[PDB]
Design an enzyme around this catalytic site. Structure first.
Site, mmCIF file in Angstrom:
data_model
loop_
_atom_site.group_PDB
_atom_site.id
_atom_site.type_symbol
_atom_site.label_atom_id
_atom_site.label_comp_id
_atom_site.label_asym_id
_atom_site.label_seq_id
_atom_site.Cartn_x
_atom_site.Cartn_y
_atom_site.Cartn_z
ATOM 1 N N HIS A 202 0.820 -1.191 0.000
ATOM 2 C CA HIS A 202 0.000 0.000 0.000
ATOM 3 C C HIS A 202 0.859 1.248 0.000
ATOM 4 N N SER A 206 -0.552 -0.276 -6.430
ATOM 5 C CA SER A 206 -0.411 -1.332 -7.409
ATOM 6 C C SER A 206 0.463 -0.842 -8.544
ATOM 7 N N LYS A 228 -15.362 -4.722 -11.624
ATOM 8 C CA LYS A 228 -14.534 -5.470 -12.547
ATOM 9 C C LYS A 228 -14.173 -6.809 -11.919
ATOM 10 N N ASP A 229 -14.018 -6.844 -10.587
ATOM 11 C CA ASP A 229 -13.693 -8.072 -9.878
ATOM 12 C C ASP A 229 -14.872 -9.034 -9.904
ATOM 13 N N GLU A 272 0.092 -33.959 -5.680
ATOM 14 C CA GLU A 272 -0.931 -33.191 -6.355
ATOM 15 C C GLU A 272 -0.334 -32.372 -7.491
HETATM 16 C C1 HEM Z 1 -3.167 -15.945 -0.559
HETATM 17 C C2 HEM Z 1 -2.443 -15.582 -1.580
HETATM 18 C C3 HEM Z 1 -2.499 -14.199 -2.033
HETATM 19 C C4 HEM Z 1 -3.494 -13.282 -1.996
HETATM 20 C C5 HEM Z 1 -4.889 -13.487 -1.416
HETATM 21 C C6 HEM Z 1 -2.939 -12.133 -2.644
HETATM 22 C C7 HEM Z 1 -3.686 -10.974 -2.838
HETATM 23 C C8 HEM Z 1 -3.222 -9.857 -3.506
HETATM 24 C C9 HEM Z 1 -3.992 -8.717 -3.800
HETATM 25 C C10 HEM Z 1 -5.463 -8.545 -3.478
HETATM 26 C C11 HEM Z 1 -3.169 -7.825 -4.403
HETATM 27 C C12 HEM Z 1 -3.568 -6.464 -4.920
HETATM 28 C C13 HEM Z 1 -4.329 -6.605 -6.253
HETATM 29 C C14 HEM Z 1 -3.603 -7.406 -7.319
HETATM 30 O O1 HEM Z 1 -2.564 -6.946 -7.832
HETATM 31 O O2 HEM Z 1 -4.010 -8.518 -7.776
HETATM 32 C C15 HEM Z 1 -1.888 -8.419 -4.508
HETATM 33 C C16 HEM Z 1 -0.781 -7.805 -5.049
HETATM 34 C C17 HEM Z 1 0.446 -8.453 -5.020
HETATM 35 N N1 HEM Z 1 0.724 -9.711 -4.643
HETATM 36 FE FE1 HEM Z 1 -0.465 -10.966 -3.984
HETATM 37 N N2 HEM Z 1 -1.704 -12.342 -3.037
HETATM 38 C C18 HEM Z 1 -1.377 -13.566 -2.692
HETATM 39 C C19 HEM Z 1 -0.212 -14.292 -2.884
HETATM 40 C C20 HEM Z 1 0.895 -13.679 -3.454
HETATM 41 C C21 HEM Z 1 2.076 -14.306 -3.801
HETATM 42 C C22 HEM Z 1 2.347 -15.757 -3.600
HETATM 43 C C23 HEM Z 1 2.898 -13.328 -4.314
HETATM 44 C C24 HEM Z 1 4.284 -13.415 -4.765
HETATM 45 C C25 HEM Z 1 5.059 -14.487 -4.877
HETATM 46 C C26 HEM Z 1 2.246 -12.103 -4.283
HETATM 47 C C27 HEM Z 1 2.862 -10.950 -4.675
HETATM 48 C C28 HEM Z 1 2.050 -9.849 -4.835
HETATM 49 C C29 HEM Z 1 2.668 -8.628 -5.360
HETATM 50 C C30 HEM Z 1 4.109 -8.409 -5.706
HETATM 51 C C31 HEM Z 1 1.671 -7.753 -5.468
HETATM 52 C C32 HEM Z 1 1.825 -6.355 -6.017
HETATM 53 C C33 HEM Z 1 1.543 -6.534 -7.507
HETATM 54 C C34 HEM Z 1 1.036 -5.289 -8.180
HETATM 55 O O3 HEM Z 1 -0.102 -4.799 -7.922
HETATM 56 O O4 HEM Z 1 1.803 -4.830 -9.050
HETATM 57 N N3 HEM Z 1 1.018 -12.352 -3.776
HETATM 58 N N4 HEM Z 1 -1.939 -9.673 -3.933
HETATM 59 C C1 HEM Z 2 -5.591 -22.320 2.136
HETATM 60 C C2 HEM Z 2 -6.545 -22.970 2.760
HETATM 61 C C3 HEM Z 2 -6.659 -24.413 2.532
HETATM 62 C C4 HEM Z 2 -6.163 -25.212 1.537
HETATM 63 C C5 HEM Z 2 -5.311 -24.755 0.362
HETATM 64 C C6 HEM Z 2 -6.605 -26.530 1.873
HETATM 65 C C7 HEM Z 2 -6.275 -27.658 1.129
HETATM 66 C C8 HEM Z 2 -6.769 -28.893 1.457
HETATM 67 C C9 HEM Z 2 -6.524 -30.012 0.698
HETATM 68 C C10 HEM Z 2 -5.728 -29.958 -0.562
HETATM 69 C C11 HEM Z 2 -7.136 -31.086 1.259
HETATM 70 C C12 HEM Z 2 -7.156 -32.472 0.627
HETATM 71 C C13 HEM Z 2 -8.568 -32.480 -0.001
HETATM 72 C C14 HEM Z 2 -9.088 -33.819 -0.441
HETATM 73 O O1 HEM Z 2 -8.534 -34.370 -1.418
HETATM 74 O O2 HEM Z 2 -10.074 -34.387 0.093
HETATM 75 C C15 HEM Z 2 -7.784 -30.607 2.433
HETATM 76 C C16 HEM Z 2 -8.473 -31.416 3.296
HETATM 77 C C17 HEM Z 2 -8.988 -30.860 4.452
HETATM 78 N N1 HEM Z 2 -8.962 -29.567 4.852
HETATM 79 FE FE1 HEM Z 2 -8.169 -28.140 3.968
HETATM 80 N N2 HEM Z 2 -7.317 -26.507 3.003
HETATM 81 C C18 HEM Z 2 -7.361 -25.282 3.444
HETATM 82 C C19 HEM Z 2 -7.965 -24.759 4.522
HETATM 83 C C20 HEM Z 2 -8.552 -25.533 5.479
HETATM 84 C C21 HEM Z 2 -9.033 -25.004 6.706
HETATM 85 C C22 HEM Z 2 -8.991 -23.561 7.212
HETATM 86 C C23 HEM Z 2 -9.592 -26.040 7.383
HETATM 87 C C24 HEM Z 2 -10.144 -25.802 8.722
HETATM 88 C C25 HEM Z 2 -10.010 -26.886 9.422
HETATM 89 C C26 HEM Z 2 -9.403 -27.215 6.565
HETATM 90 C C27 HEM Z 2 -9.836 -28.451 6.872
HETATM 91 C C28 HEM Z 2 -9.618 -29.528 6.026
HETATM 92 C C29 HEM Z 2 -10.120 -30.876 6.395
HETATM 93 C C30 HEM Z 2 -10.878 -31.242 7.644
HETATM 94 C C31 HEM Z 2 -9.726 -31.708 5.421
HETATM 95 C C32 HEM Z 2 -9.938 -33.192 5.383
HETATM 96 C C33 HEM Z 2 -11.281 -33.556 4.813
HETATM 97 C C34 HEM Z 2 -11.095 -33.647 3.307
HETATM 98 O O3 HEM Z 2 -10.181 -34.246 2.673
HETATM 99 O O4 HEM Z 2 -11.931 -33.050 2.628
HETATM 100 N N3 HEM Z 2 -8.786 -26.846 5.415
HETATM 101 N N4 HEM Z 2 -7.512 -29.264 2.525
HETATM 102 C C1 LIG Z 3 -8.668 -5.823 2.832
HETATM 103 C C2 LIG Z 3 -9.839 -5.977 3.804
HETATM 104 C C3 LIG Z 3 -10.377 -4.681 4.442
HETATM 105 C C4 LIG Z 3 -9.812 -4.252 5.804
HETATM 106 C C5 LIG Z 3 -8.555 -3.371 5.728
HETATM 107 C C6 LIG Z 3 -7.279 -4.207 5.668
HETATM 108 C C7 LIG Z 3 -6.672 -4.218 7.057
HETATM 109 C C8 LIG Z 3 -5.330 -3.497 7.056
HETATM 110 C C9 LIG Z 3 -5.499 -2.112 7.663
HETATM 111 C C10 LIG Z 3 -4.466 -1.793 8.731
HETATM 112 C C11 LIG Z 3 -3.147 -1.415 8.081
HETATM 113 C C12 LIG Z 3 -2.817 0.063 8.184
HETATM 114 O O1 LIG Z 3 -3.386 0.645 7.034
HETATM 115 C C13 LIG Z 3 -2.969 1.984 6.922
HETATM 116 O O2 LIG Z 3 -3.995 2.789 7.509
HETATM 117 C C14 LIG Z 3 -4.067 4.182 7.162
HETATM 118 C C15 LIG Z 3 -5.445 4.679 7.589
HETATM 119 O O3 LIG Z 3 -6.443 3.641 7.735
HETATM 120 C C16 LIG Z 3 -3.754 4.476 5.669
HETATM 121 O O4 LIG Z 3 -3.470 5.860 5.515
HETATM 122 C C17 LIG Z 3 -3.943 6.430 4.287
HETATM 123 O O5 LIG Z 3 -5.315 6.824 4.365
HETATM 124 C C18 LIG Z 3 -5.698 7.900 5.245
HETATM 125 C C19 LIG Z 3 -7.130 8.297 4.834
HETATM 126 O O6 LIG Z 3 -7.811 7.229 4.143
HETATM 127 C C20 LIG Z 3 -4.704 9.098 5.306
HETATM 128 O O7 LIG Z 3 -4.668 9.667 6.634
HETATM 129 C C21 LIG Z 3 -3.245 8.772 4.903
HETATM 130 O O8 LIG Z 3 -2.610 9.959 4.404
HETATM 131 C C22 LIG Z 3 -3.061 7.614 3.903
HETATM 132 O O9 LIG Z 3 -1.707 7.144 3.888
HETATM 133 C C23 LIG Z 3 -2.534 3.691 5.158
HETATM 134 O O10 LIG Z 3 -2.224 3.933 3.770
HETATM 135 C C24 LIG Z 3 -2.713 2.206 5.427
HETATM 136 O O11 LIG Z 3 -1.481 1.543 5.139
#
Ligand code: HEM
Ligand code: HEM
Ligand SMILES: CCCCCCCCCCCCO[C@@H]1O[C@H](CO)[C@@H](O[C@H]2O[C@H](CO)[C@@H](O)[C@H](O)[C@H]2O)[C@H](O)[C@H]1O
Ligand SMILES: CCCCCCCCCCCCCCCCCC(=O)OC[C@H](COP(=O)([O-])OCC(O)COP(=O)([O-])OC[C@@H](COC(=O)CCCCCCCCCCCCCCCCC)OC(=O)CCCCCCCCCCCCCCCCC)OC(=O)CCCCCCCCCCCCCCCCC
Ligand SMILES: CCCCCCCCCCCCCCCCCC(=O)OC[C@H](COP(=O)([O-])OCC[N+](C)(C)C)OC(=O)CCCCCCCCCCCCCCCCC
Ligand SMILES: CCCCCCCCCCCCCCCCCCCC(=O)O[C@H](COC(=O)CCCCCCCCCCCCCC)COP(=O)(O)OCCN
Ligand SMILES: CCCCCCCCCCCCCC(=O)OC[C@H](COP(=O)([O-])O)OC(=O)CCCCCCCCCCCCC
Lengths: 383, 75, 438, 85, 54, 124
Positions: A202, A206, A228-229, A272
């Protein structure tokens, strides 16, 4: 002053999801961020629900999963949703990392979100590996065996550490119960890191597909990227639906429907699909310890992209040579994936090694070379 | 009479030069000792650490050579 | 090569010291006295400064008015200052007006009236000075810095003294002070510029021969100070600029570490955003402060006394939200004197000082101040050749050793004046006196 | 590096006039047919080589590898397999 | 006593090294000392005290 | 990499007759295929600016150059989001692709590199 800006808590929400200033030209590859958040939410909801029906004891685990499939209302859906969303999570995470590599999101000033991202990627792998074991089918057990024995490569202490992970002398009940507890926890750790990489991002905001500043032309996150999302959310849910409802087992391994049997080793043990490229890299190195280091290095090497990219220009939109090299890198990563699931036979042995060399040489040789040359071509070319 | 000031540039990298780093070499030594002592201390309980490291130390090493009598060991 | 400083004594033990410069046409003669505020106790604190105002209020021969006229007729001026350990009375004149000036100085020192009427008149003038120093912020900061560093000790006292003493200083106490302290063995008659040494010695035999000698003649610059780590905060939110001094116990004039302390001081150096060249200075702290606009200025100092000193830095800043950064970075630069300094910094600072110690001596008043200061602190003038050798003897190893004994993890005295809300409490400042990474 | 609305950190702007119309005033799908056909063809044509080259190369490589592998584990490929191991 | 400060306390690397080495020594000696103390206050009660009969 | 490095290396190439004979034509085609001119950018508009050095160089641009740069970025951003290319006068012609920023960044970097060198000087 408006409430959403006045109130500290609302203002944090506001800063991220509403007034957040975004570049006005983000293309659809900026949508994977939100899809990954959606996957994370689906996995949490389905996972917590599965946890209410699953029993972590090895005498009951497999049967508890069958009980979910057969007896729990909509259990089939919740189980398939959880298993398929694990696959979609990796498709989206690779897409997101692909976007970041192509558009130079790893360059200054975004090295920190990139580097935290590499950790998120490791946590996703660990989360997904442990979750797979919880079914305690044949692939569950044998996968756990193979992967935990990699720790045996650590010199001197390796063996002791493996027995410590297992809680015993082989993968068994103690291992399964500890994997349950950790698999439950790891997604919360993952969510924290996901949130940290956003907070880190942040400061710079982006990137955008041109790789120029967007400070000149910003758009509120809502409504523009909100709506858009939604398009990709519905596109994702359509793909989700086709797997979950119509082909729920396409992405799975049949052997996981056989209960774990420590005696019989399955015909082919593959991980996998989303771990397959790293598996191929491991097979390429003949040494045990070498293979493990290579496998880990294939992920940790991402951390050096900020260094080895020498370009004065951010991202590849304007760099024809870099775009070609990127294309070959991505196709090689898919080839590695495929070589991860073939049998260890000629001629795939040599091929696997060549693909592994190409994988590493991208980071260490080609990207530094190509980026240096393109710097010069832009300068001389525009004189 | 002096026409030009007399100096050279020492080789440097990321703002480090050899004169500066050489002053810190001892300090890395001590921190490495601290990390060594600390690490070894953390795994002093690990049976392999006692067997391979700690029991081999002269005089002191007998602190870690302890047998459960066969009569009191169920396993 | 500078001309030799000639030195002679009289019978009473008055030192006469001269450095002739036949290139100039003006001369500064004066009397440097190894006595100052430090020689008072708590009851007569302020006496020395009081006397300085009364020395010019007429003698047994010339009245206040006659005195004014006599100096006006000379052509030059007279000047005086009292510090903690030194009092100076000098007269700048023309070449051939030196016999008049020595005569006037001898008169105001030995034969001052100190008439009750004039004591009473100055008692208000000095009382009004208490409420106008308030404006000279640098001096306010340094006076509080001495007060706290040498808490309840003679060096900790102010020069003016407390209001209470100003109201109760009598001609008796004034007389007793100058009788006990202004003795021939504690005085140096100095001449710089267009003076002949032999002529000056004759003038001393004519005017200063009937000076009292002290009972126990110790050598010049002979002295127990116990520094107190402490802070004074004089927060004033209405002031636009914060002034902050930080000091540790420094070195005396005769310390073996005197030059090492100077070199260390030069490594940190001074900075002033108003001077053009300052943004390009080599000092690490200068770079940090200029790039980040953390301060208007800073000035490293190493003040010495006969038996102790203060070594530290004086900072001024309008950046009231980042005072924490300014202080942080400053003390981390001091840490590097202990941890990091190499021949690079040390040799750079030696080069800067080898010139600096000579460049200060411009006009006759600076030369006279130099001869006077050295004679009353060391008992001799140190030749440039000796100074160059003592600086050359300072190695990087010596600077590190000195800093590790003097600065590293040591108590500081800290004074902040102005909008210093952002200055953290004593602990967090003092915590910057070490590095946990080292 | 980025500020917030009102101090975003743009260099000073001057002299650009921006115009736009209400979403209710505009046809959201105006010229969609032309775009879907001509614009997509243009964008696809310009990127086609960067996709075709690596895809075709790696598919050819895989095809050769998979065909050799298949052939080595036939009767006919016994000898070549024995040498390869 | 200056010397003691200079060697073990002045550098934090040294001070942390000293603290950890002291913790190691303390840990080992305290263990042994408590073992002996516990055996004396619970004398004739523990298995090790009656084991000899069997 | 630093603009200084890019510029120095380029000058080494342009000096060598052999090298320039083979590199100049390649670099011209590269730039044609790069296609930044089709969005109305000048080459220098693409240089990463989120570094302290580049922020300083941009601040040193003459007002006119600066205002026009902002326009080219805004215009290009609008082409990007529309998925259109520039047409007519919006396309950068090779004669308009001037290195407006290179002199400023070279001066900024020259001083920063001198500063690094001089921070490491040893009195001999
Ligand atoms: C749970 C997995 C992740 C979530 C939910 C997540 C989510 C996001 C989101 C919402 C943004 C801002 C919007 C976007 O650019 O798409 C973002 C930006 C970014 N994420 Fe991720 N991300 C994840 C995993 C990763 C991983 C594995 C990487 C890198 C290896 C990564 C690197 C970045 C970077 C570098 C940005 C800035 C990119 C840009 O806006 O130019 N993230 N991510
Ligand atoms: C990033 C989040 C998660 C990923 C990527 C993930 C991935 C997986 C995968 C790959 C399996 C094997 C699925 C199958 O072939 O049946 C699995 C099973 C399972 N996961 Fe997760 N999981 C996640 C989050 C969670 C969370 C938060 C819970 C909370 C307990 C959970 C509970 C389970 C349970 C109970 C199973 C065994 C039952 C089953 O195979 O369906 N998982 N998960
Ligand atoms: C994504 C799910 C939604 C929940 C929010 C995500 C949780 C993370 C929030 C806590 C992290 C701190 O987040 C930080 O907060 C302040 C104010 O809120 C922001 O501050 C920004 O906005 C405020 C007004 O909007 C201005 O005073 C400031 O000049 C500007 O930098 C920072 O840019 C952000 O980095
Ligand atoms: C998984 C979960 C499902 C959810 C769906 C998410 C996928 C959306 C996404 O990011 O991709 C759509 C995405 C549309 O994104 P966009 O915002 O129109 O353009 C992004 C690029 O700039 C588009 O690049 P462009 O403007 O240069 O146009 C190129 C594109 C044409 O792009 C399209 O409009 C299609 O054509 C191709 O590159 C095709 C390759 C030619 C081989 C034949 O399509 C592609 O870009 C496909 C090319 C990828 C290789
Ligand atoms: C399969 C091979 C892919 C090669 C891509 C080459 C560029 C291209 O044609 O793509 C279209 C577009 C080209 O877009 P662009 O932004 O370069 O150009 C837009 C139009 N101009 C040039 C006029 C401004 O590229 C993308 O959108 C690339 C996103 C990369 C996602 C990759 C996911 C792979 C996962 C592996 C992870 C490890
Ligand atoms: C899944 C279901 C989709 C969301 C349903 C929302 C209802 C849609 C219709 C309502 C609508 O358009 O009104 C807006 C509500 O949208 C909103 O306020 C939300 C806009 C879109 C919501 C989704 C945001 C990103 C989706 C991706 C998920 C993110 C990852 C986390 C899992 C108001 O808003 P307006 O400003 O248009 O009103 C203009 C005047 N008041
Ligand atoms: C157990 C806990 C471990 C804590 C380890 C801390 C080690 C950090 C040492 C360190 O800061 O060295 C600095 C030195 C260069 O000095 P400078 O440029 O900071 O003056 O840096 C180099 O010489 C390189």
């Amino acid at each position: 002053m408006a409430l959403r800006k006045k109130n500290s808590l609302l203002n944090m929400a506001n800063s991220y999801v509403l007034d957040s200033p975004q570049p006005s030209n983000l293309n659809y590859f900026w949508n994977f961020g939100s899809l990954l958040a959606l996957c994370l939410v689906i996995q949490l909801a389905t996972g917590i629900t599965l946890a209410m029906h699953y029993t972590s004891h090895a005498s009951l685990a497999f049967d508890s999963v069958e009980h979910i499939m057969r007896d729990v209302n909509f259990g089939w859906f919740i189980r398939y949703a959880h298993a398929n969303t694990a696959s979609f999570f990796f498709i989206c995470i690779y897409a997101h990392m692909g976007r970041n590599i192509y558009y130079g999101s790893y360059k200054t000033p975004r090295v920190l979100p990139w580097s935290i991202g590499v950790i998120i990627f490791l946590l996703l792998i660990i989360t997904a590996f442990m979750g797979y074991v919880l079914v305690f089918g044949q692939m569950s057990l044998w996968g756990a065996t193979v992967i935990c024995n990699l720790v045996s490569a650590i010199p001197w202490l390796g063996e002791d550490i493996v027995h410590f992970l297992w809680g015993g002398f082989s993968v068994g009940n103690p291992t399964l119960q500890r994997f349950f507890a950790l698999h439950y926890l790891m997604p919360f750790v993952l969510a924290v890191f996901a949130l940290l990489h956003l907070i880190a991002l942040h400061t710079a905001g982006s990137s955008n597909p041109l790789g120029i500043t967007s400070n000149v032309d910003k758009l509120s996150m809502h409504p523009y990227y909100s709506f858009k999302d939604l398009i990709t959310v519905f596109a994702f849910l359509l793909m989700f639906t086709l797997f979950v409802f119509f082909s729920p087992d396409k992405l799975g391994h049949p052997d996981n429907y056989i209960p774990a049997n420590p005696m019989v080793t399955p015909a082919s043990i593959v991980p996998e699909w989303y771990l397959l490229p790293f598996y191929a890299i491991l097979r390429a190195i003949p040494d045990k310890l070498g293979g493990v280091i290579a496998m880990v290095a294939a992920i940790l090497i991402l951390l050096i992209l900020p260094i080895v990219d020498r370009s004065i220009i951010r991202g590849n939109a304007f760099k024809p040579i870099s775009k070609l090299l990127f294309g070959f890198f991505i196709c090689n990563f898919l080839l590695l994936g495929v070589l991860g699931q073939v049998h260890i036979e000629p001629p795939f042995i040599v091929l696997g090694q060549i693909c592994t060399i190409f994988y590493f040489s991208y980071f260490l040789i080609l990207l530094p070379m190509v980026s240096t040359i393109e710097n010069i071509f832009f300068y001389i070319g525009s004189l | 009479y002096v026409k030009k000031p007399s100096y050279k540039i020492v080789p440097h990298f990321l703002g480090f030069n050899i004169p500066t780093v050489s002053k810190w070499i001892p300090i890395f030594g001590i921190w490495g000792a601290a990390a060594g002592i600390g690490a070894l201390f953390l795994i002093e309980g690990v049976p392999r650490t006692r067997q391979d490291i700690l029991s081999k130390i002269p005089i002191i090493g007998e602190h870690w050579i302890r047998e459960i009598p066969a009569s009191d060991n169920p396993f | 090569v500078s001309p030799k400083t000639r030195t002679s004594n009289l019978k009473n033990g008055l030192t006469i010291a001269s450095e002739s410069n036949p290139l100039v046409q003006t001369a500064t003669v004066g009397v440097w006295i190894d006595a100052g505020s430090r020689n008072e106790n708590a009851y007569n604190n302020g006496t020395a400064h009081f006397f300085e105002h009364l020395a010019f209020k007429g003698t047994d021969k010339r009245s206040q008015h006659q005195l004014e006229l006599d100096i006006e007729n000379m052509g030059g001026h007279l000047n005086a200052y009292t510090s903690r350990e030194s009092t100076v009375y000098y007269a700048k004149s023309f070449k051939d007006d030196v016999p008049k000036s020595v005569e006037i100085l001898a008169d105001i020192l030995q034969h001052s009236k100190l008439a009750e009427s004039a004591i009473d008149r100055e008692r208000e003038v000095i009382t009004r000075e208490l409420e106008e120093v308030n404006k000279q912020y640098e001096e306010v900061v340094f006076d509080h810095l001495h007060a706290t560093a040498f808490m309840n000790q003679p060096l900790g006292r102010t020069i003016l003294g407390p209001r209470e003493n100003i109201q109760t200083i009598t001609n008796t106490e004034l007389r007793k002070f100058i009788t006990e302290n202004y003795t021939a063995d504690r005085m140096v008659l100095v001449g710089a510029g267009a003076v002949d040494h032999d002529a000056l010695v004759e003038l001393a035999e004519k005017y200063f021969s009937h000076l009292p000698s002290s009972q126990s003649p110790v050598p010049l610059g002979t002295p127990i100070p116990n520094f107190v780590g402490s802070e004074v905060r004089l927060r004033d939110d209405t002031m636009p600029v914060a002034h902050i001094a930080i000091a540790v116990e420094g070195v005396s004039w005769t310390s073996e570490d005197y030059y090492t302390a100077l070199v260390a001081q030069a490594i940190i150096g001074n900075y002033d955003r108003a001077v053009g060249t300052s943004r390009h200075q080599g000092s690490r702290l200068s770079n940090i402060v200029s790039e980040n606009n953390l301060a208007n200025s800073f000035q490293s100092f190493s003040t010495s006394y006969s038996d102790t000193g203060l070594w530290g830095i004086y900072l001024t800043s309008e950046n009231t939200t980042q005072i924490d950064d300014l202080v942080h970075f400053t003390l981390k630069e001091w840490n590097r004197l202990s941890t990091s300094v190499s021949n690079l910094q040390v040799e750079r600072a030696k080069s800067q000082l080898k010139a600096g110690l000579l460049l200060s001596l411009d006009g006759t008043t600076y030369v006279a101040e130099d001869i006077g200061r050295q004679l009353t602190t060391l008992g001799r003038r140190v030749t440039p050749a000796e100074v160059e050798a003592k600086l050359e003897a300072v190695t990087e190893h010596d600077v590190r050793a000195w800093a590790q004994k003097t600065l590293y993890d040591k108590d500081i005295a800290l004074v902040g004046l102005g909008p210093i809300e952002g200055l953290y409490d004593y602990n967090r400042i003092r915590n910057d006196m070490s590095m946990m990474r080292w | 590096y980025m500020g917030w609305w009102g101090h975003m950190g743009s260099p000073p702007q001057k002299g650009i006039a921006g115009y736009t119309i209400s979403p209710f005033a505009a046809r959201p799908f105006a010229g969609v047919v032309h775009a879907a056909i001509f614009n997509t063809f243009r964008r696809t044509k310009n990127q086609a080589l960067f996709v075709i080259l690596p895809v075709s190369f790696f598919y050819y490589v895989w095809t050769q590898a998979s065909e050799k592998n298949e052939w080595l584990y036939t009767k006919a490929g016994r000898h070549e397999l024995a040498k390869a191991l | 006593a200056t010397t003691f400060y200079n060697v073990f306390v002045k550098r934090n690397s040294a001070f942390v090294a000293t603290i950890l080495a002291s913790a190691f020594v303390f840990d080992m000696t305290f263990e042994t000392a408590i073992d002996n103390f516990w055996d004396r206050i619970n004398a004739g009660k523990q298995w090790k005290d009656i084991r000899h009969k069997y | 990499a630093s603009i200084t490095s890019v510029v120095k290396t380029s000058e080494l190439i342009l000096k060598s007759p052999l090298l320039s004979k083979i590199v100049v034509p390649l670099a011209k085609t590269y730039v044609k295929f790069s296609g930044y001119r089709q969005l109305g950018f000048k080459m220098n508009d693409l240089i990463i600016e989120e570094t302290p050095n580049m922020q300083l160089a941009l601040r040193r641009l003459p007002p006119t150059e600066s205002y026009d740069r902002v326009y080219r970025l805004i215009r290009a951003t609008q082409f990007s989001l529309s998925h259109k290319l520039a047409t007519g006068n919006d396309i950068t012609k090779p004669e308009e692709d001037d290195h407006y920023l290179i002199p400023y960044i070279l001066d900024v970097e020259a001083e920063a590199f001198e500063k690094d060198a001089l921070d490491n000087l040893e009195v001999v």
